[PDB]
Each structure stands twice: as C-alpha cells, then as structure tokens.
Amino acid sequence: LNQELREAIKNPAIKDKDHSAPNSRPIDFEMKKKDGTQQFYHYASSVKPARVIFTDSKPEIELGLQSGQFWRKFEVYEGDKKLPIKLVSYDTVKDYAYIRFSVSNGTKAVKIVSSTHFNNKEEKYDYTLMEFAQPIYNSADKFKTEED
C-alpha cells in the first residue's frame, strides 16, 4: 500500500465501494500477546471475521473493521515472511476500513502489528499473536498451477 491507513478512509477511489463474490469462503481467529492482552476491548483490535479468496497454494485473504478514524498503520508476518497489505474498499459513513493480503502456505499462527492514535491518547504496539480457526489455504486438491 502507498498511504497511511488513516488517509485511506477518505481517498475517493476506494471510498463508497465494496467487493463480495462466490470466489471466496469465510474465516475467523483468536488473538493475544505474552503480557496477557486478549483482543476484545476495542472494536478495531478485537477478534473478527474474514474471507479467504480462491488462488494457488498461496491464497489471498480479505479483512474489514470499524474505528477507521483511529488506526494509523498495520503489518502482518509469519516468521520472517511478510504478508503484503493493499486497500480494497472503505466507508467513512460507517467509520469502516477494508484491506486484502497474500497469505503464506497453509498458515496457522501469525505475528501481528497494529497502531492507534485518537484524541489526546496514544495506543501503540510491541508484539501481538493471532491463531487460526482452520488452515488459511486454497484447496490444492482442485488446482495449484495449470501450465504447458
């Protein structure tokens, strides 16, 4: 992505648009860190639904959230492997922000970064963990690569 997440909520090209299609299935998760945070108290960081988009053995995943005026930046890692984020669609009437990223092979647990600043307050990260409902995968048994 080319911008800060907070600026993307007003950028006109993605504001007032969607994307939803039969080319996908839903997913969900658990979240925490080692200091004893368990995500449920703020609606942007709280545990969420998602959707897995049909690809090769590295799939793509789509994520939407609210408090879009509060979040400032996001990053997703599995070990050293970064899952690269892009903008998809936004709604400043719902205070809503929505993104996509390209996933590693069959992901089960993820190292997460998220940043916040609203009002006088600042709420920044050191470390965060997500863990799966089921493997984030593509169903390779039907397609991996079809070439000649």
UniProtKB/Swiss-Prot annotation:
List where in the cell it is found: Secreted, Cell wall
Q: Which domain of life is it from?
A: Bacteria
Q: What is the effect of changing F40D?
A: Complete loss of binding to metHb
Induction per UniProt is:
Repressed by fur in the presence of iron. Transcriptionally up-regulated by hydrogen peroxide and to a lesser extent by hypochlorous acid. Slightly down-regulated by human neutrophil azurophilic granule proteins.
**Residues covered by the NEAT domain:** 20-145
Q: How has the protein been applied in practice?
A: A combined vaccine containing IsdA, IsdB, SdrD and SdrE afforded significant protection in mice against a lethal challenge with S.aureus Newman or any of the clinical isolates NRS252, N315, NRS248, USA100 and USA400. The immune response elicited by the combined vaccine is greater than the one elicited by its individual components.
UniProt family annotation: Belongs to the IsdB family.
Subunit structure, as described in the record: Interacts with host HBA; this interaction allows heme extraction as iron source. Interacts with IsdA.
Quoted from the entry, the domain comment is: The two NEAr transporter (NEAT) domains act in concert to bind, extract, and transfer heme from hemoglobin to downstream Isd proteins.
Function summary = Cell wall-anchored surface receptor that extracts heme from oxidized methemoglobin/metHb to enable growth on hemoglobin as a sole iron source. Rapidly extracts heme from hemoglobin and transfers it to IsdA or IsdC, which then relays it to the membrane transporter/IsdEF for internalization. Also promotes resistance to hydrogen peroxide and killing by neutrophils.
The protein here is known as Iron-regulated surface determinant protein B
